[PDB]
Amino acid sequence: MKTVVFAYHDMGCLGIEALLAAGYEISAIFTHTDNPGEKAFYGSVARLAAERGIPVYAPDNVNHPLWVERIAQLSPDVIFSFYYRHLIYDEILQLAPAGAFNLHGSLLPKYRGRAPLNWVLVNGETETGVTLHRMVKRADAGAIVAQLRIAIAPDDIAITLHHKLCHAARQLLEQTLPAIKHGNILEIAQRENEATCFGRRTPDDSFLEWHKPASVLHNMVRAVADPWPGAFSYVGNQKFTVWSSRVHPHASKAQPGSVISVAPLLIACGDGALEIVTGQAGDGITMQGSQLAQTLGLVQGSRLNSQPACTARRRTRVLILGVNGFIGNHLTERLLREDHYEVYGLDIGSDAISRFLNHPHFHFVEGDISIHSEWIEYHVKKCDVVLPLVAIATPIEYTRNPLRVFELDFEENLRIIRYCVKYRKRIIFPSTSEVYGMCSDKYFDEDHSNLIVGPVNKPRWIYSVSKQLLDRVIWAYGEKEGLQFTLFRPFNWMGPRLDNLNAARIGSSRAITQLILNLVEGSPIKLIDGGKQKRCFTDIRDGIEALYRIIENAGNRCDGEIINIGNPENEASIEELGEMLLASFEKHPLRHHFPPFAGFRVVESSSYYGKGYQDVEHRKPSIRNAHRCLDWEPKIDMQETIDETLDFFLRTVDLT
Amino acid sequence: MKTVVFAYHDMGCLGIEALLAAGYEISAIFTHTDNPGEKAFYGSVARLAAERGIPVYAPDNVNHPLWVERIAQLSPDVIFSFYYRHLIYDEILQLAPAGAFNLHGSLLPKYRGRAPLNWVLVNGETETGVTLHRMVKRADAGAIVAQLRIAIAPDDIAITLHHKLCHAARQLLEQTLPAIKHGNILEIAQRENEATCFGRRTPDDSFLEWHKPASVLHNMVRAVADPWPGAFSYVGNQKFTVWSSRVHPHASKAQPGSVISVAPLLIACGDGALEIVTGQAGDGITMQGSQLAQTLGLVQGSRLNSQPACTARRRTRVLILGVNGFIGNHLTERLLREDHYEVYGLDIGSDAISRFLNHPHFHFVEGDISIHSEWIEYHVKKCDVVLPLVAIATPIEYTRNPLRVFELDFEENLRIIRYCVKYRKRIIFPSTSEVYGMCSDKYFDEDHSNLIVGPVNKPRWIYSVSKQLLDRVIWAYGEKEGLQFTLFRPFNWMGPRLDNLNAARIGSSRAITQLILNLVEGSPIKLIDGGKQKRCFTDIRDGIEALYRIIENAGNRCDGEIINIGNPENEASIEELGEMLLASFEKHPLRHHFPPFAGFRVVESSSYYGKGYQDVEHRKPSIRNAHRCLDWEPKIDMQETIDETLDFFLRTVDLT
Amino acid sequence: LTERLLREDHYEVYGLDIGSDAISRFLNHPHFHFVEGDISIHSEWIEYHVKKCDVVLPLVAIATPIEYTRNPLRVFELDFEENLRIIRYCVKYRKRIIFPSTSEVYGMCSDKYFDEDHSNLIVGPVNKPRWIYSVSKQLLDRVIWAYGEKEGLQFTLFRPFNWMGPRLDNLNAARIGSSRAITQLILNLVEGSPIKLIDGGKQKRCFTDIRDGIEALYRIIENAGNRCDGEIINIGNPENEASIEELGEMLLASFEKHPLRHHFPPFAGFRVVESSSYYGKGYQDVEHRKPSIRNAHRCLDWEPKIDMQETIDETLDFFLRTVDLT
Amino acid sequence: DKYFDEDHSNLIVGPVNKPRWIYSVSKQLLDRVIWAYGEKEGLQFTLFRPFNWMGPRLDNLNAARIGSSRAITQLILNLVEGSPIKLIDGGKQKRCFTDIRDGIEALYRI
16 A cells, blocks of 8 residues: 655656556655746646645755654655656665665666666667666666567657557556566676776767767757757857758768759768758747758858857956965966966066966966956956955954955955956855854864854954855855856965065964974974864865866856865874974985974963964864865875975075 | 738647648748747647648748738738737738638627637636637627537536637638638628727736635636636735635635635635635645645634735836926826826926925935936836936037037936846836938838938937937847837827927927917917928827836837837828917907917018928828837827917916 | 933934834924935935034844845845945044944854853854845944954944834834734734644743833943943843743733723634644754843943833733724 | 938938947947037047958958958858859849058048
8 A cells, every 4th residue: 555656747647547546545755846947748747646635745954864764754665766866866875775666768777867768869779668677775786677679660750659658658557567566576686797987978068060970960869859958059150950850861972062952951971961851040940941051052062160160168268366376376377287278467576477478378467456446347357267366464464454354355355256247257266264263063064064253352353254254245146146156265275385485574474484484493393292283284286276177167067166175184293293304304405404402391382272362173174065066186195295395495595 | 822821829730730631732821939938838830840841931020011012912812810919900901802811719709808718718608619700990800600619617627628629620620611712601790889998807906805706716717727827816925826626515604714624725705615725836836735734834714914915016116317307297297196106206407396296206306317326326226117308409409519419318328228237127218209310201110110311411410310329229238138128209299388498309399389479479370381391299198198008018018119109190280280279269268368460471581491401291100019019099189289288378378 | 212312401313214104203303303315325414414423323224034035235235335334434533333233143152141252153154145144244343343443433332132112113023024923923913813823832032122222222322431432232131031932821911901892812723743844944043042231231230120021011002002904 | 322422422221120230320420429529629530431442461260250241251262162152143233342552542641
């Protein structure tokens, strides 16, 4: 009596009708909200089910343990599924403790993804059918119960196909239910020995390249025929779609280029001859080929290029606003190793970018974010990617002048962001790792962590709250006004361009400079017992690689994300008491090389352990969106970073 | 080739199937893509015709004189129509001696309106049908040939009834094609003269009223049944669509809102009782009443918020720039006579709107479009409809100094236009009748006439070109950035409160004012050698009614449109105008007003006109988009307008 | 606050607002000077009257709970940009500002008692578009503090904790603002409906009568001995804690005393015990809402006096007597 | 007009719904504001109309469709690619071309 059915389309509707005729009460149906606008040529299942009285639930929190307990309490005995999200779910894979039956309409276990029947028709196969198998913990690890073979008629039409599908469904439902119910499944094993990936299911968008065989073109044109999105191509300033063609006897000795008939439209290809019956003018309806053939006026000898090269991918012009900064220069020296990239910048110097003088693609104006507002106004109109990598906030500055962390680090950025919304550009806004403040979470996740700041009377959380509100108004702009954006959070990046030189008296600014002075100046301070702090550092190379992948945006899958770019696994307790420095102090020169002394007085002098100025827990990030939207994972460890930094810093002071 | 067909919708598709099956060779069908056609069914026509290789045509815009000439030059004798809306019938049908045949889907001629299915189903009749009829000099007054009878049942649903109607129509066509081919139709004289006009169907009046009987509710629920969006109210914070009902004892004594039983959900009403089995919450899932009731945390007994439906009516705010002018102060007196209108305003004076300053919703703020630009920016952001009725373009002004007509009538209007494109607001921009210039068309068409101007050395065409380019900028903004607009062209609006220069631009010529001023004293009515100027005038009442209909946008029929508001059939020369003016001036009193001695019979004086050497003879508006989009036709004749203007001038002269 | 100021002689009020619906009693006062308008196009008026007056109160707060999730650009541009503009008029002309902060700056603060000098402010991740209001107001307070530290700006910040009383209709409460606890319950009371349709005593929702809060704000305005400048004062009732069910019970008990004509019949309605798919889905946030009056009891010498029963009677009297069918 | 006179010929354009005349009108209002400026502000100007200037070193092949619709460029493309020239209506339509070296000697004289 207890049975769960996920039904869809006409076969699902008739299955529901048959089950009600037999009188089995479906336990529960879990479906999602219907899309507002879609080609709904089928009937409305939800309304019919409501008339039948079957309850419908919409789980807001499928991750919730409560709903899992509910599903367990329901005691799922027998579940049938009919094209419901193909392999039901992916992340959980636990909803089938006793197993379930999945009916698929493709050649399992290969051809993974969406629209499987269309894709197997793309390759031009003459064999289809249905595959039933048990649902276990490992995906596609159930033996095929039965697999019938139905021939694909060369002249098959849609109505005959519908009648054949109905006949097959009737044959299945009439007297095959007892066979499945009895338990004649002989599952032993499946695959698990080859595991050979053919092509990793390359999308290849929908470009109609003529180099591709004409047979494949006919196949996917029929596959994407009505009702489906269909092929959509555009050459020059004119777009065209191939909506309907009929196969014709392909010639071998055809003498391509000799058009003997323009009506109907017949052009030559790499192999064979395709006869396109009807197509659509894009901004209209289906039209006969002969009229378009007469309208275009093409004559023998005219060759259609395989790629229009009208807009192509242009240049992907990138606009940086901190191009002389650490990240600003390390990203400029990486974007210029490619070909499809233009770079800009308006920092207040060119000391770290003197290397780039007259490369094919680079520009430099050397202005100010406040004074030079028209240049930025026009350059968030010409470019397509904006990286406001500019910020003037010394840790001291929150006490010297807290209003400089607002009028410059919040309002200039706010003005820049309002440029990307009035021109509909993309902005990769650099957030900070201080937004979380003193979050107690072990892993500073970017999606479900609580940003904790101090009281209003502490004049040091204005930077963190300013950046947090900047991210919030970026998110609101993105989700209300159609702003493509991507926040990214650097996590203690360390490269050999950290603070240039100490000309600006940055020695007493922060301990990050005392680390530099540790190796050169005589500093008898090495006996720190870790400080109970997990100093997670990341090399600049990995961060720049991640930022490059963010800029690439492979398939528009980095939009509206808050990726953190760090190395949560590369921790270092006080540089391992100088272990690698013991191996790297030998180098080559002997000047200034003297063995250090020893001694330890107090931990208090080194670091501050106050109430207001304290980061509770540690600073280890959580890279989850980085591993998905970039498929990126850190490779460089602390040793190479330390030696490279020391070597570069030694070379940047020459001799004296 | 004969018998071209205007078909559309699924009935049109099946009629195409029928004519193809019968062997009747029709080579031309008319259909419209209909972008606002977001119905669940795509309703695509001629697909099978395209697949069969039949050469068909797809003419989108029939009213273009090119298509008219092509469809007229072959001179056919039969034009078939099958559920083709957008009638706007014209001379093309009158050309054919045999006329045209149109198939209406209701029992003509009683209560035809628009969407006649609602009209026939609201009255709870027991028999409906279709009617193939002729075309006449009137609108939708074709003779009935036969009356189909298949009857209706309360249990019968929309799907079954529509399928039966489709099959019956198929058989009817298949058996009557010989009948129409051989004619012998016996149409009887119809009673079209004694009919009912001036009434339409609007969804806005379909609110749920408890006092209506259960019969009317049952009727309009079945009328809007599936497949259709549904007729729903707007209660506080819960959506529901009436899908199904069950006949229950019509004796609920309790007041509306009381739930008699929760399984199934049955509510009480003022009369009868509706049983809502299921409801659709907006765009999600059509789900049952009980589960929805338990989902929203409401219990049995929860009454509804009486007659107020949440927030009914919002009082759309109209931002009129130039309220003290001739059109601004006549429109305000018209918008303030109704509800749901919260008029705003800004001009340099309030001498003519002095009667609205104490109105609950007038909000007049004195200012100038230049100095007070932030006020305009804010009020274009808060309001909904913007009417820039500011004119500083006296002919003397833009001839003596065209730089002002540029910096004021192009650069100030362009700013207001660009306010509505960033705040996404509707703008009804007043164009001018001067755009056509020296056009050589009898009727100045809004979509087909050419705009002719003189050479650049003539600075008298700068105003016309400036306004024409202003229309081309608005048109390009609603085609590239989605801007809702409606250009209207005042064609010689005449009425009271027409000052000398204050209404010489947005109003009309000073003719009537000149003769009245010369008539209050003994000055003559001296004519001109070209006294037969043949000037057509429009009453301010008719123009304001048309502009109010434009503001309403009843069914989004005025969107992206250009409408001339004029009276082309109100032609009158200066002599006739003077005759009627004198006749109305003598009237009953005949006293004071000075002796009206006037008249001259030579008045040659050779010539004294320098810029009068060129004059236009074609100045007739083509009012068809007005009677296609707002269904407006001028009513007031010239004598009434003359009398009203004279009476206003004589009572408001304020003399002794 | 205007009616409290216009009874104590030496006070010249200058009010700006879009309408005079609830202040019709003061336009005939010799020292009221009301002006009709909105703060988007009155920049000159506001600037001139900041330069002219001595104390400035930007009580203009347009923050609907729905507006937190709907088009929060409006929330940011009206509750942060105009407030920022007004704050910078008070540093140009060296004027005092009494800024209304919000009790929502603490957010999910774990502390039982919300201290304004020691407690932490906790907010959710950036993806949830509901905390933009709290962060905007917190940044406004931090900017005011920075201005009163670097520019010598005389300021005071006050945080209201669920003030209730007569005339609470404006745009938050009342029929128009149906998204509210008290007004929805009282509307369900007025019209015969199943009152107390809840499945158990909810969190203790403390309320403060408007009279005590207005007294505290008046003492802030007085600035006796200048011991209130440079402070953040919490104005609330940490002792008037009451659950929703207890509130309904006491309101019904007060109704029982002189129930007019017994023309409003209360009712009850049963609901599914399981309450599957309901409001509670992880929005517990905090369960205390306890303010700290330790700052209002040291700077204002203020201690709340009016208890819950008098507040309920006052609000009910106003609601049932001032309005009628229209 | 048979001959496009610079001070007597009338300028005719299509309706607003035809968006191809927005370039003719934009450049026609620019000549009417230069004329207006030269009458009330004493601006020294000269408005030259190059009709069909054609010559060597024209626009290079770019991201658009062979630069622009230039008629002659289509013919050169057909000659280079060996495409037969489509004789539409047998070449009845004429075109009056001007050499760049001839119109440049007039621009320099201006």
